[PDB]
């Protein structure tokens with residue numbers, strides 16, 4: 613009876629999992645470690661150019677915005 617999690621349940625899980633600090637937001641450094649798994653460095657320019665708020669970190673929302 614419990615409503616499952618949006619099809620993006622996987623993305624949300626991984627993101628949160630990478631955030632052992634349970635802050636709900638990943639920092640530039642974190643974004644590099646997560647993407648590092650692919651060996652892609654472009655993630656740095658993408659996360660820096662995607663940060664319109666210059667907060668230096670991305671929350672669940674942002675993480676879901678960077679997937680395509």
Ligand SMILES: [Ca+2]
Pocket residue numbers: 630631632633634635636637638639642
């Ligand atoms: Ca984090």
Ligand SMILES: [Ca+2]
Pocket residue numbers: 662663664665666667668669670674
């Ligand atoms: Ca941001």
